[PDB]
Scaffold this active site. Structure first.
Site, PDB file in Angstrom:
ATOM      1  N   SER A  42       0.779  -1.242   0.000  1.00  0.00           N
ATOM      2  CA  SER A  42       0.000   0.000   0.000  1.00  0.00           C
ATOM      3  C   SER A  42       0.811   1.293   0.000  1.00  0.00           C
ATOM      4  O   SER A  42       0.233   2.378  -0.046  1.00  0.00           O
ATOM      5  CB  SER A  42      -0.965   0.027   1.179  1.00  0.00           C
ATOM      6  OG  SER A  42      -1.981  -0.951   1.031  1.00  0.00           O
ATOM      7  N   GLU A 140      -5.389  -3.543  -6.610  1.00  0.00           N
ATOM      8  CA  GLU A 140      -5.765  -4.341  -5.446  1.00  0.00           C
ATOM      9  C   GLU A 140      -6.751  -5.425  -5.866  1.00  0.00           C
ATOM     10  O   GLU A 140      -7.651  -5.162  -6.665  1.00  0.00           O
ATOM     11  CB  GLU A 140      -6.398  -3.460  -4.368  1.00  0.00           C
ATOM     12  CG  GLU A 140      -5.520  -2.325  -3.884  1.00  0.00           C
ATOM     13  CD  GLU A 140      -4.447  -2.769  -2.918  1.00  0.00           C
ATOM     14  OE1 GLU A 140      -4.322  -3.987  -2.651  1.00  0.00           O
ATOM     15  OE2 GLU A 140      -3.728  -1.888  -2.415  1.00  0.00           O
TER      16      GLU A 140
HETATM   17  C1  LIG Z   1      -1.968  -2.243   1.492  1.00  0.00           C
HETATM   18  O1  LIG Z   1      -0.735  -2.588   1.949  1.00  0.00           O
HETATM   19  C2  LIG Z   1      -3.142  -3.094   1.906  1.00  0.00           C
HETATM   20  C3  LIG Z   1      -3.722  -2.442   3.127  1.00  0.00           C
HETATM   21  N1  LIG Z   1      -2.660  -1.650   3.658  1.00  0.00           N
HETATM   22  C4  LIG Z   1      -2.915  -1.535   5.058  1.00  0.00           C
HETATM   23  C5  LIG Z   1      -1.748  -1.173   5.817  1.00  0.00           C
HETATM   24  O2  LIG Z   1      -1.530  -1.667   6.954  1.00  0.00           O
HETATM   25  O3  LIG Z   1      -0.985  -0.342   5.339  1.00  0.00           O
HETATM   26  C6  LIG Z   1      -3.716  -2.710   5.497  1.00  0.00           C
HETATM   27  S1  LIG Z   1      -5.209  -2.006   6.210  1.00  0.00           S
HETATM   28  C7  LIG Z   1      -5.071  -1.857   7.935  1.00  0.00           C
HETATM   29  C8  LIG Z   1      -6.024  -2.082   8.988  1.00  0.00           C
HETATM   30  N2  LIG Z   1      -4.941  -1.673   9.879  1.00  0.00           N
HETATM   31  C9  LIG Z   1      -4.700  -1.512  11.308  1.00  0.00           C
HETATM   32  N3  LIG Z   1      -5.998  -1.462  12.079  1.00  0.00           N
HETATM   33  C10 LIG Z   1      -5.662  -0.668  13.425  1.00  0.00           C
HETATM   34  C11 LIG Z   1      -4.609   0.357  13.053  1.00  0.00           C
HETATM   35  S2  LIG Z   1      -3.968  -0.147  11.641  1.00  0.00           S
HETATM   36  C12 LIG Z   1      -3.988  -1.458   8.779  1.00  0.00           C
HETATM   37  C13 LIG Z   1      -4.053  -3.398   4.228  1.00  0.00           C
HETATM   38  C14 LIG Z   1      -3.280  -4.680   4.103  1.00  0.00           C
HETATM   39  C15 LIG Z   1      -4.091  -3.173   0.792  1.00  0.00           C
HETATM   40  C16 LIG Z   1      -5.405  -3.749   1.211  1.00  0.00           C
HETATM   41  O4  LIG Z   1      -4.306  -1.919   0.203  1.00  0.00           O
END
Ligand SMILES: *C(=O)[C@@H]([C@@H]1NC(C(=O)O)=C(SC2CN(C3=NCCS3)C2)[C@@H]1C)[C@@H](C)O
Length: 265
Positions: A42, A140
């Site tokens: 991402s 994605e």
């Molecule tokens: C991109 O790498 C994928 C997307 N990117 C993102 C990330 O961590 O950068 C996750 S979403 C996510 C939910 N989360 C945590 N919840 C509490 C605080 S942070 C991070 C996901 C894999 C791609 C789907 O675009």
């Protein structure tokens, strides 16, 4: 020795780690595996938003984008709620960066347009910023799933740091567009356990994370010292040894960042 510290973390988390911090007035560049390819995951969404900002008048942010049930194909905390009503380009940029919304990124790529559903224009954008290394090949959720070693959908800590530097500190965008990008990264919700965790509280941190298969965990940031001195920090990691379902380990990036912060102090 920094290299020894980084190698030690690699052993601790059975991982491959890449780090880059560009040189400044009085600091040498910090580099570990900095020219090895790592999956964007991402992290591409930060330059994706810059591309969309750059491509259009600022009030393009107000254009409403509509989408459907079959458009939700990846983690999309925001977009999942608005297929009914749609989302503005502004809301999409906001979601893509602050919540790392995958559907928002797909829609933003479609907005940028052209071959590969926008992946070609996205890559073209990076080339215009002098990045001859990075490439985006898929949207994605495919872009997170290339096997370890594959060059598809990859950047390097070195390449992405140079791009981010131009975006936030340099003149890639006009001031008003630059401020928009910076504020979104400043208000990121996904980065508390990464680069942010490695720097003292009186340092400002803005960032965009990446997470994926094969234990992939990335973070790209711009940080400011308590006296307003900026540094760009790119940390990338994977754990190919664990295979496709290998867990990403945020602690690895927090520790890496802590090491870097020690040097930058
Ligand atoms: C991109 O790498 C994928 C997307 N990117 C993102 C990330 O961590 O950068 C996750 S979403 C996510 C939910 N989360 C945590 N919840 C509490 C605080 S942070 C991070 C996901 C894999 C791609 C789907 O675009």
């Amino acid at each position: 020795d920094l290299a020894d510290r980084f190698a030690e973390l690699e052993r601790r988390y059975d991982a491959r780690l890449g780090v880059y911090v560009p040189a400044t007035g009085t600091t040498a560049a910090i580099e570990y595996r900095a020219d090895e390819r790592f999956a964007f995951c991402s992290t591409f969404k930060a330059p994706l938003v810059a591309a969309v900002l750059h491509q259009n008048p600022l009030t393009h942010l107000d254009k409403l984008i509509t989408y459907t049930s079959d458009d939700i194909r990846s983690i999309s905390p925001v977009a999942q709620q608005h297929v009914q009503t749609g989302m503005t380009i502004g809301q999409l940029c906001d979601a893509a960066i602050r919540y790392s919304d995958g559907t928002a990124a797909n829609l933003l790529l479609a907005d940028l347009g052209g071959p590969g559903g926008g992946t070609a224009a996205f890559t073209g954008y990076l080339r215009s910023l002098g990045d001859t290394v990075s490439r985006l090949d898929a949207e994605e959720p495919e872009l997170n799933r290339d096997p370890p070693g594959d060059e598809r959908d990859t950047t390097t800590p070195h390449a992405i740091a140079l791009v981010l530097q131009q975006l936030v500190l340099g003149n890639a965008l006009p001031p008003d567009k630059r401020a928009l990008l910076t504020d979104w990264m400043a208000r990121n919700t996904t980065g508390a356990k990464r680069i942010r965790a490695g720097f003292p509280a009186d340092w400002k941190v803005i960032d965009k994370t990446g997470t994926g298969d094969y234990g992939r965990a990335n973070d790209i940031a711009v940080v400011w010292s308590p006296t307003g001195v900026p540094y760009v920090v790119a940390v990338m990691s994977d754990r190919a040894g664990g295979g496709y379902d290998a867990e990403p380990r945020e602690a690895l990036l927090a520790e890496a960042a802590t090491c870097v912060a020690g040097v930058l102090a």
